Design an enzyme around this catalytic site. Sequence first.
Site, PDB file in Angstrom:
ATOM      1  N   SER B  46       0.815  -1.213   0.000  1.00  0.00           N
ATOM      2  CA  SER B  46       0.000   0.000   0.000  1.00  0.00           C
ATOM      3  C   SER B  46       0.845   1.259   0.000  1.00  0.00           C
ATOM      4  CB  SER B  46      -0.929   0.021   1.220  1.00  0.00           C
ATOM      5  OG  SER B  46      -2.084  -0.772   1.012  1.00  0.00           O
ATOM      6  N   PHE B  47       2.044   1.195   0.564  1.00  0.00           N
ATOM      7  CA  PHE B  47       2.779   2.412   0.869  1.00  0.00           C
ATOM      8  C   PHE B  47       4.053   2.592   0.054  1.00  0.00           C
ATOM      9  CE2 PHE B  47       0.774   0.749   4.860  1.00  0.00           C
ATOM     10  CZ  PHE B  47      -0.342   1.570   4.807  1.00  0.00           C
ATOM     11  N   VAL B  50       8.405  -2.859  -2.729  1.00  0.00           N
ATOM     12  CA  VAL B  50       9.353  -3.731  -2.053  1.00  0.00           C
ATOM     13  C   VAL B  50      10.456  -4.041  -3.059  1.00  0.00           C
ATOM     14  CG1 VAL B  50       9.715  -5.909  -0.849  1.00  0.00           C
ATOM     15  CG2 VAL B  50       7.545  -4.679  -0.594  1.00  0.00           C
ATOM     16  N   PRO B 117      14.162 -16.367  -1.837  1.00  0.00           N
ATOM     17  CA  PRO B 117      14.252 -16.436  -3.305  1.00  0.00           C
ATOM     18  C   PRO B 117      13.009 -17.010  -3.969  1.00  0.00           C
ATOM     19  CG  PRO B 117      15.607 -18.132  -2.273  1.00  0.00           C
ATOM     20  CD  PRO B 117      15.172 -17.211  -1.175  1.00  0.00           C
ATOM     21  N   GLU B 120       6.363 -15.533  -3.275  1.00  0.00           N
ATOM     22  CA  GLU B 120       5.102 -15.761  -2.573  1.00  0.00           C
ATOM     23  C   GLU B 120       4.462 -17.093  -2.940  1.00  0.00           C
ATOM     24  OE1 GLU B 120       2.859 -11.810  -3.016  1.00  0.00           O
ATOM     25  OE2 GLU B 120       4.778 -11.487  -4.078  1.00  0.00           O
ATOM     26  N   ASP B 159      -3.582 -11.346   9.120  1.00  0.00           N
ATOM     27  CA  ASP B 159      -3.589 -11.225   7.663  1.00  0.00           C
ATOM     28  C   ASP B 159      -3.026 -12.479   6.999  1.00  0.00           C
ATOM     29  OD1 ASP B 159      -4.411  -9.813   5.375  1.00  0.00           O
ATOM     30  OD2 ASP B 159      -2.496  -8.776   5.193  1.00  0.00           O
ATOM     31  N   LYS B 161      -2.800 -15.361   4.464  1.00  0.00           N
ATOM     32  CA  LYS B 161      -3.212 -15.622   3.081  1.00  0.00           C
ATOM     33  C   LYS B 161      -1.970 -16.026   2.306  1.00  0.00           C
ATOM     34  CE  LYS B 161      -2.935 -10.615   2.064  1.00  0.00           C
ATOM     35  NZ  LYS B 161      -3.695  -9.412   1.596  1.00  0.00           N
ATOM     36  N   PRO B 162      -2.117 -16.726   1.170  1.00  0.00           N
ATOM     37  CA  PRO B 162      -0.930 -17.126   0.392  1.00  0.00           C
ATOM     38  C   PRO B 162      -0.064 -15.965  -0.081  1.00  0.00           C
ATOM     39  CG  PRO B 162      -2.873 -18.319  -0.373  1.00  0.00           C
ATOM     40  CD  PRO B 162      -3.361 -17.238   0.571  1.00  0.00           C
ATOM     41  N   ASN B 164       1.028 -13.602   1.588  1.00  0.00           N
ATOM     42  CA  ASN B 164       1.914 -13.210   2.678  1.00  0.00           C
ATOM     43  C   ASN B 164       2.818 -14.341   3.174  1.00  0.00           C
ATOM     44  OD1 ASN B 164       1.029 -10.558   2.705  1.00  0.00           O
ATOM     45  ND2 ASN B 164      -0.436 -10.858   4.400  1.00  0.00           N
ATOM     46  N   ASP B 177       4.882  -9.774   6.324  1.00  0.00           N
ATOM     47  CA  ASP B 177       3.956  -8.650   6.407  1.00  0.00           C
ATOM     48  C   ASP B 177       3.229  -8.629   7.743  1.00  0.00           C
ATOM     49  OD1 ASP B 177       2.256  -6.472   5.944  1.00  0.00           O
ATOM     50  OD2 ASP B 177       2.139  -6.936   3.777  1.00  0.00           O
ATOM     51  N   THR B 194      -8.105  -9.464   4.984  1.00  0.00           N
ATOM     52  CA  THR B 194      -8.436  -9.591   3.578  1.00  0.00           C
ATOM     53  C   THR B 194      -9.785 -10.284   3.447  1.00  0.00           C
ATOM     54  OG1 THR B 194      -6.083  -9.711   3.073  1.00  0.00           O
ATOM     55  CG2 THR B 194      -7.591 -10.457   1.366  1.00  0.00           C
TER      56      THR B 194
END
EC number: 2.7.11.11
Lengths: 20, 337
Positions: B46-47, B50, B117, B120, B159, B161-162, B164, B177, B194
């Site tokens: 959001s900010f 990365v 490496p 996600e 939070d 979820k896959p 993260n 995260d 989410t």
Amino acid sequence: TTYADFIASGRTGRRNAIHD
Amino acid sequence: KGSEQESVKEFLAKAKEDFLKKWESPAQNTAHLDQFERIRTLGTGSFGRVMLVKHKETGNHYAMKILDKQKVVKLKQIEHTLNEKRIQQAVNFPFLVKLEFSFKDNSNLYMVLEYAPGGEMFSHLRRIGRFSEPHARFYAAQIVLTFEYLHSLDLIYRDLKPENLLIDQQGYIKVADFGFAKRVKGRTWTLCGTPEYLAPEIILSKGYNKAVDWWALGVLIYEMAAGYPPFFADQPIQIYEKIVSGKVRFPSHFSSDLKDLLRNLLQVDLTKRFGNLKNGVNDIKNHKWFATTDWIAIYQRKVEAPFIPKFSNFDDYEEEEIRVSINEKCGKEFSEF
Ligand SMILES: O=C(Nc1c[nH]nc1-c1nc2cc(CN3CCOCC3)ccc2[nH]1)NC1CC1
């Protein structure tokens, strides 16, 4: 199929969190 | 007794002491942007971007999360962002991404994360379609142990979820995260997470606790094993109607053991939801579906991963240089960062 319904949906990419 | 459970309770006791010293005395200002060679964008939050970065004096690679301070303020995420960094620098666990360095300048906050490496889980899950149950179980077990660890510290993760979960070079998970992680004894109220992964008590503005993490584990296991989540639609509002409806259907290929674990995790009634009962995490660890799981072996990474990342391969982005403003933005808001 449910898989086919998912793949055709708008929510198969990375999902944003909600912040209210 | 419970010789196993006594070894658990003693490990957690020592872990909580390590965490508490760091929680009370956070590492701060441990690097500077010019020490890092910025290689490419790994992804976005959001900010800010990365970035894949190299620490110049060690040659180590990290993922550097950039957070525009003004964007954090405008999204009313100041306190969540301070939680994130304060919690992440204090925890220590095999399946948690480490915050190696953090710092800020006039414009940004920077969180220099341990680099995985493999990227996600989300990417590999969508490409392969679904994981077979043994593959899903391998990942689920690491989440079970990680939530047992975090919850003993009075941390809620909020939070799962896959997107993260990162896959490391050995094929194990690292939870990334901590933007919604929170240290709370008792109940909390923030509507965050989410949509597909929100527990019903969150949607209902009810006040909630760590049990939302166990509901979210049910969603994750389901999505890993099915290739789609148990509640989905085109609009979050339709997702929330299904989550609170009390109904869920399992693919025909889910084993009956899997279906039973997921019916107790995806339980709308807090008093009946696994992880939230008298035995806590052990109603999960001792479940049928986990009978072959060697929890200690998982923890010390003796189990062979079902999937090792392909040993260049990143989604391309347009890459622009970081612009640091001449004046300090939001200095008082982020003073403790
Ligand atoms: O903190 C994050 N990521 C990381 C923390 N530590 N390490 C990472 C990391 N993030 C990575 C991202 C990729 C991009 N790939 C694109 C194609 O599908 C696989 C991932 C590859 C390797 C990655 N490693 N946030 C995600 C990028 C938005």
